[PDB]
């Protein structure tokens, strides 16, 4: 289970996510990576999933994010769809919902997604030859 292709699903989705920016992607999320890091792999996944669920829940219909143009609206819908897809995969990996996140620091969603991508690529690297 630890080295399941779900890791590839998460990475591919993070790649799609980090290739769009926006007013939306500068809005913030609680920075689970600001911890001094006393945390199981499963607890990290639950944490990341929780904050991302907070984000897409809060901003799916946010007027700052919805967009004026057809293109901006499309990219918003794509962001929300990909955040849900990423979240679905993260919860599947976590096998958990009870993971309080206590961090004060907020980071932009963009910065949080890049950090998560780094962590996930490292996991992938640690799984393969």
Numbering used by the authors: 1 to 129
Quote what the paper states about this structure.
Interleukin 4 (IL-4) is a pleiotropic cytokine that plays a major regulatory role in the immune system. Signal transduction of IL-4 is mediated by a sequential binding process, initiated first by binding of IL-4 to its high-affinity single membrane spanning receptor chain IL-4Rα. This intermediate ligand receptor complex then recruits one of two possible low-affinity receptor subunits, the common gamma chain (γc) or the IL-13Rα1 chain, into the functional hetero-trimeric complex to initiate signalling. The overall structure of IL-4 comprises the known four-helical bundle in up-up-down-down topology, which like the crystal packing is unaffected by these mutations.
The structures of the IL-4 variants T13D (max. resolution 1.65 Å), F82D (max. resolution 1.7Å) and T13D-F82D (max. resolution 1.8Å) were refined on the basis of the structure of wild-type IL-4 (max. resolution 1.8Å); all crystals were obtained under identical conditions, allowing detailed comparison. For comparison, in the structure of wild-type IL-4, the hydroxyl group of Thr13 is hydrogen-bonded to the main chain carbonyl of Glu9; the side chain of Arg85 is moved outward towards the solvent and fixed to the hydroxyl group of Thr13 by a water-mediated H-bond. The change in side chain conformation of Arg85 becomes clear if the side chain torsion angles of the wild-type and variant are compared. The χ1 torsion angle of Arg85 is in the trans conformation (174° IL-4, 176° IL-4 T13D) for both proteins; in the case of IL-4, χ2 of Arg85 is slightly off trans (160°), whereas for T13D, the torsion angle χ2 of Arg85 is in the trans conformation (176°). In contrast, the χ3 torsion angle differs by 115° between IL-4 (58°, gauche- conformation) and T13D (-57°, gauche+ conformation). In contrast, in our current study, the temperature factors for the side chain atoms of Arg85 are of similar magnitude in the high-resolution structures of wild-type IL-4 (mean 23Å2 for side chain from Cβ) and its variant T13D (mean 20Å2). These values are also close to those of the atoms located in the hydrophobic core (mean 15Å2), therefore the side chain of Arg85 can be considered rigid. Cluster III consists of the positively charged residues Arg81 and Arg85 of IL-4 and the negatively charged residues Asp66, Asp67 and Asp125 of IL-4Rα. Arg81 and Arg85 of IL-4 form several hydrogen bonds with residues of IL-4Rα; however, these interactions do not seem productive. Therefore, the conformational entropy is not decreased for Arg85 in the formation of the T13D-IL-4Rα complex, whereas for wild-type IL-4 the side chain of Arg85 becomes ordered only upon binding to IL-4Rα.
